[PDB]
Amino acid sequence: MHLNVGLRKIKETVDQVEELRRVNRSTALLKSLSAERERWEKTSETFKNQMSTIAGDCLLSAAFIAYAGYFDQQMRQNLFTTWSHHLQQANIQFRTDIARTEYLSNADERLRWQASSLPADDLCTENAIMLKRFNRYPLIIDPSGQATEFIMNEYKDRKITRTSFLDDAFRK
């Protein structure tokens, strides 16, 4: 909507220039504004391009968040590849250059995770993304123990508490 308002704003500037012409200074202004509109239309072309490809990226990302939560890196990659191949078969435009670790995460959140002692592995990045965004309460399977440290560091400001099922004070 912002881009389209600006798109008609360019035509308003064109109207102002036309009123001015009704002359070489205004002519130079007109031609450079035409180059400005050239930039506008190339931006809108690629911008409608990601409009066309937004659906497939969201589909793949959602399928990856909901599923693939137990499988290892190899099997997650295999499922993503099969999904992408099927989407290619169905002529559904999904952008490929993006990493699933980058679409669903922001730079500020990634930096906070790094400050929260998150191992820089991309698998751990996917796990962090899934922990951030979920519909069912996650079940963390961490034999290493790094995930617990990451959760405590991330949610320290909210005063996250540690407790175990064996503890009787769990219910309280």
Partner: protein, 181 residues
């Protein structure tokens, strides 16, 4: 904490899983990133600039775009020649060319940063094999129980606080010394 536990189907339905077990590829990539950030700090900053050409340079491009947009949104001086947005157009073209040349620099990353990754690639595979030898070491004796945090402690004590790296600055010699240590 148990990674091999089996859960009833109801539990698998009510909750989503976030697997954190370390695999050969997982440890490989983790240690690759660890040595990338620890070693070649200038080239680590180069990889940080690889991240910056997406999170800042593209960000600067888009923010200068929107700043130009708002500046020409003012529409001050009706009739009068106030379309001096042209300098911001020149800056926008410079920013776009910078982002495209940064994409070309990422193409060079398919040549140079990938070289930094593959030079440490044998180290990552070797140390992953080391850790899983340590894990498989628990079979021959009940006392040979080593955690991943321990192996990461050795990894840090080798990368950092290493007396053998104080007098060495060349990347290849540092890599040989770091593998030996």
């Amino acid at each position: 904490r148990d990674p091999t536990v089996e859960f009833p189907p109801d539990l698998c339905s009510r909750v989503t899983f976030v697997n954190f077990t370390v695999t050969r590829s997982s440890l490989q990539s983790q240690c690759l990133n660890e040595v990338l950030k620890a070693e070649r700090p200038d080239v680590d900053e180069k990889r940080s600039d690889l991240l910056k050409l997406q999170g800042e340079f593209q960000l600067r491009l888009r923010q200068l775009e929107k700043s130009l947009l708002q500046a020409l949104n003012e529409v001050k001086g009706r009739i009068l020649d106030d379309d001096t947005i042209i300098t911001t157009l020149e800056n926008l073209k410079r920013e776009a060319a910078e982002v495209t040349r940064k994409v070309e620099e990422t193409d060079i990353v398919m040549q140079e940063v990938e070289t930094v990754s593959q030079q440490y690639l044998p180290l990552s595979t070797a140390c992953s094999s080391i850790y899983f030898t340590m894990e498989s070491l628990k079979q021959i004796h009940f006392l040979y129980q080593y955690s991943l945090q321990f192996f990461l402690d050795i990894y840090h004590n080798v990368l950092y606080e290493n007396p053998n790296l104080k007098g060495v600055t060349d990347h290849t010699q540092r890599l040989s010394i770091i593998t030996k240590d």
